[PDB]
Amino acid sequence: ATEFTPSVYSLVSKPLPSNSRPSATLDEQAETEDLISQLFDLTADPNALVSEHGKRYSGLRKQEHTQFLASSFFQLPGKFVSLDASRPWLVFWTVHSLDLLGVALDQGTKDRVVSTLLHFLSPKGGFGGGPANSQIPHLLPTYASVCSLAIAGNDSSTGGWKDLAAARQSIYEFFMRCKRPDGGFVVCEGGEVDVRGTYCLLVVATLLDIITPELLHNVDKFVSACQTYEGGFACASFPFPEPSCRVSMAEAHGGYTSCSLNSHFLLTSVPLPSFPLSIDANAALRWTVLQQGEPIEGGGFRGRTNKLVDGCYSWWVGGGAPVAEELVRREKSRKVIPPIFNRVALQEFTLVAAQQDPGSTGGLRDKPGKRPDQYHTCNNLSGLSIAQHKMSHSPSTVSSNRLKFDASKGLPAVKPVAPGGGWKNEDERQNARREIWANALGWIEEEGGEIIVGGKDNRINTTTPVFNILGLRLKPFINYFYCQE
Amino acid sequence: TYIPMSQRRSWADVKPIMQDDGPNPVVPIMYSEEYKDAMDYFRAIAAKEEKSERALELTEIIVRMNPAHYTVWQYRFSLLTSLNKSLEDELRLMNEFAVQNLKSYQVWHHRLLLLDRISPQDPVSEIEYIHGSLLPDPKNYHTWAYLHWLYSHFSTLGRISEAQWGSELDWCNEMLRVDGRNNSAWGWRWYLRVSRPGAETSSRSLQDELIYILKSIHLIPHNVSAWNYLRGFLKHFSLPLVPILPAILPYTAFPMPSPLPEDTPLPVPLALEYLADSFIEQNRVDDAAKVFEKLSSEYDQMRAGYWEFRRRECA
Numbered sequence A: 001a002t003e004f005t006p007s008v009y010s011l012v013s014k015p016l017p018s019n020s021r022p023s024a025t026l027d028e029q030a031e032t033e034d035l036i037s038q039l040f041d042l043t044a045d046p047n048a049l050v051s052e053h054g055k056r057y058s059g060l061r062k063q064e065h066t067q068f069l070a071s072s073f074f075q076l077p078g079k080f081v082s083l084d085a086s087r088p089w090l091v092f093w094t095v096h097s098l099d100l101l102g103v104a105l106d107q108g109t110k111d112r113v114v115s116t117l118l119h120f121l122s123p124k125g126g127f128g129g130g131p132a133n134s135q136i137p138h139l140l141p142t143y144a145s146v147c148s149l150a151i152a153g154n155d156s157s158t159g160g161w162k163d164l165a166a167a168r169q170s171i172y173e174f175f176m177r178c179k180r181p182d183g184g185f186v187v188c189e190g191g192e193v194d195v196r197g198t199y200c201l202l203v204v205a206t207l208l209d210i211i212t213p214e215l216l217h218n219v220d221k222f223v224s225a226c227q228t229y230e231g232g233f234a235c236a237s238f239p240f241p242e243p244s245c246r247v248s249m250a251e252a253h254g255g256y257t258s259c260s261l262n263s264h265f266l267l268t269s270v271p272l273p274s275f276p277l278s279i280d281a282n283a284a285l286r287w288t289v290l291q292q293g294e295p296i297e298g299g300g301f302r303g304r305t306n307k308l309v310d311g312c313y314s315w316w317v318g319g320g321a322p323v324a325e326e327l328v329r330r331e332k333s334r335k336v337i338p339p340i341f342n343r344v345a346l347q348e349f350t351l352v353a354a355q356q357d358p359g360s361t362g363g364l365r366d367k368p369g370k371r372p373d374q375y376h377t378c379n380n381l382s383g384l385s386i387a388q389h390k391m392s393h394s395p396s397t398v399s400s401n402r403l404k405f406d407a408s409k410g411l412p413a414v415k416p417v418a419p420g421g422g423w424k425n426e427d428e429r430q431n432a433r434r435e436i437w438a439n440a441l442g443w444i445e446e447e448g449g450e451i452i453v454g455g456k457d458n459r460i461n462t463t464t465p466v467f468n469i470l471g472l473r474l475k476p477f478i479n480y481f482y483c484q485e
Numbered sequence B: 001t002y003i004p005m006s007q008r009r010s011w012a013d014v015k016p017i018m019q020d021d022g023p024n025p026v027v028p029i030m031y032s033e034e035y036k037d038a039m040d041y042f043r044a045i046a047a048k049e050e051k052s053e054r055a056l057e058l059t060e061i062i063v064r065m066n067p068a069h070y071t072v073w074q075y076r077f078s079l080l081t082s083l084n085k086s087l088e089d090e091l092r093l094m095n096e097f098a099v100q101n102l103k104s105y106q107v108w109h110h111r112l113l114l115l116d117r118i119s120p121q122d123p124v125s126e127i128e129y130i131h132g133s134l135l136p137d138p139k140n141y142h143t144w145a146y147l148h149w150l151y152s153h154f155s156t157l158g159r160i161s162e163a164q165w166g167s168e169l170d171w172c173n174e175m176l177r178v179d180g181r182n183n184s185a186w187g188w189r190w191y192l193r194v195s196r197p198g199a200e201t202s203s204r205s206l207q208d209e210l211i212y213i214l215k216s217i218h219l220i221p222h223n224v225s226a227w228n229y230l231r232g233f234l235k236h237f238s239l240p241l242v243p244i245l246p247a248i249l250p251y252t253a254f255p256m257p258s259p260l261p262e263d264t265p266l267p268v269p270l271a272l273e274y275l276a277d278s279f280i281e282q283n284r285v286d287d288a289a290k291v292f293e294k295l296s297s298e299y300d301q302m303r304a305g306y307w308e309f310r311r312r313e314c315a
């Protein structure tokens, strides 16, 4: 299992060399190396049987993390006003982390989650960062609310899924209002264009059966032009005057690379001709693995070249690895196995460096020296899950899915904005529904692929790449909207 | 003490609207009296779609308390355009925001909208503003993306002169001199020299660029930014790796390496990567496999699995 995933404790820790050229980047790096390596030195090797006397025990402190998320759950201090336009994210970070940690909400609490989120839904379409009487709809809280409804909701009259189903046409119309001719989307009325919006929209459109040709036109081209010379993806591409050329607008970054890989992956399910425009999968895989930090910085991921490692990149970068790997696999097959990143070291970074010091607030954090928060709790745990569980997109699972799909069952077709904006006919629409549903349910945990650093009490549940909700949430949720139950 | 808005003569005609969370909401935030009051009145203002000076003042009050409130920013920009307000004054206000540490993405996006609508014949002063804001915060991701947008937008309008492009490269060169490990400035160099539509591509252009890249590597051999740029450059222009190999070979053991600078332990893993890829270019797959094996087992063990994957690709 671990021949090609050495423990940080088994490797020589050495600083990034200076080449006798000091700089601000190197000063910060050296300082961070010192901080992380010193915490590792104070902590017992999680892999040891002779769990060392005098040293900190690295076991995942699930109960502390649960208490951290609870206290944020039902009343937040005044300082949280900075996240008043991100309340659905607060919900998602909480409920998804609780799922990963194996902690159940009672039905009464789940009902409060559903009711809260329904008050964020506008009749005209989409969820905003707070109540519909206070905030306009936005692609990001639309993803966060939809996913949280998958986690906390159900098919009953008070379960929220029914309301989402009734909202399909309006959500679709919101997505079309966000659409730009070059294939990008604004995140909200008057808002920024970026690939996070594309990602959030494509996840929701996939889950709710509201994908159309007009919704997707140029969307692949926008995403593909986000890829930088480094192999990762920037937040956006700029269309020069449909466009004569498209150019990436910033650095390859973990967050935008995750969004671009996932968006591109979602598009590969869609049966349009010559669609989606290809990305350079080999380069994206290379960029991904290159972001894993050295032993001295604990084997955590950084978000961009020559910046610092940070626990949230365990999800953004580590969670993009199975996607990049699958795209590389497909490319190789179209011309014509060891782990692709250090799954052990990433777990060690999480357990040793990313957890709040014991006997305090709980929660997980960017790095030592930083306060934990809900966002870093969710993303550290999501990345931990990807490292513990070998995730594959399985062609034979997708084939089984196609075989069991019932195209005669479904919710009403979306009415396109433009007369010819829908699928050509029912054969094509149903084929599209089948492919999109079958591929969404194609991710599997490989048998015998589990690596739980530190022993089985550290095991968390399996998140799904691309979506980032548990497979046990994803399946009944997408089955509800496709009437496949 | 605070004066509630229900007691202000200027707001007497307005009936505030309460936040509608429903009963017993999750993730409720404890709000200051001031923020709750401002939002109760904003709800009323926005519901009736009032475009007025008092509404404009109210949006400033709110975004000063919560700079990330995208809804209130959207309403603010609607107000600026409806009232035909001075957009230059608004930019000055955004300048004042930065001085008062009121930064957020929404502030920068608001600047972008203002620049787009003002549509100045020459955007030099905003370029200089961006430069000044990067000096103390040199890797700010969204500031760099804004700089890319500004140049891209104004260049499609034909408003960036050759002198302007020239001074921009000079500024970029200085940023990389100050910190050669600044990947954001390397990304900007790529736009300036390679990706932008107006970039020159000639034999001398490629030559000059290669010289700059190799010199950068020789100055800081372990600098991942410079290696990735080298690899991106050769790939983009379909240039073979082999003819440059003499400049790289010393790191595996046109500008050539220095005695190497102190604190330069060998081998440099990305120099080995370059060597392996050059063997592959030559169809020498066994020799490439041998290098990948060494990267995997000895020289870059964090990526043992990846280098093993590359090794297996060869055999």
Ligand SMILES: Cn1cncc1[C@@](N)(c1ccc(Cl)cc1)c1ccc2c(c1)c(-c1cccc(Cl)c1)cc(=O)n2C
Pocket (backbone or CB within 6 Å): A083, A086, A089, A255, A310, A312, A366, A373, A374, A375
């Ligand atoms: C770049 N980064 C790396 N780690 C954290 C950050 C970030 N600068 C950030 C900003 C925007 C987005 Cl879309 C994602 C991440 C950051 C840092 C700290 C943060 C939050 C975000 C966020 C946050 C807030 C809203 C959305 C998202 Cl995705 C994240 C919440 C929070 O409580 N804290 C402490």
Ligand SMILES: CC(C)=CCC/C(C)=C/CC/C(C)=C/CONC(=O)CP(=O)(O)O
Pocket (backbone or CB within 6 Å): A140, A196, A199, A253, A254, A255, A256, A259, A303, A304, A307, A308, A310, A316, B141, B142
């Ligand atoms: C809603 C979603 C999916 C958002 C994407 C998540 C991320 C990581 C977005 C990127 C946000 C970003 C680039 C913030 C800028 O802050 N970055 C830094 O301060 C430097 P670093 O890249 O090293 O964190």
Ligand SMILES: O=S(=O)(O)C[C@H](O)CNC1CCCCC1
Pocket (backbone or CB within 6 Å): A060, A061, A062, A063, A064, A065
């Ligand atoms: O989140 S965890 O770290 O697993 C849980 C905390 O350590 C709780 N420890 C208790 C202290 C008193 C004796 C019973 C155990």
Ligand SMILES: O=S(=O)(O)C[C@H](O)CNC1CCCCC1
Pocket (backbone or CB within 6 Å): A122, A123, A124, A125, A132, A133, A134, A135, A136, B043, B046, B047, B071
């Ligand atoms: O019919 S819908 O438009 O979906 C429902 C309401 O009108 C939403 N309008 C809010 C008013 C206050 C500011 C945020 C928007």
Ligand SMILES: O=S(=O)(O)C[C@H](O)CNC1CCCCC1
Pocket (backbone or CB within 6 Å): A059, A454, A455, A456, A457, A458
């Ligand atoms: O299942 S196994 O991996 O063999 C071993 C257990 O999970 C070990 N977990 C510890 C039990 C004692 C308290 C600290 C955690």
Ligand SMILES: [Zn+2]
Pocket (backbone or CB within 6 Å): A310, A311, A312, A313, A366, A376
């Ligand atoms: Zn982070």
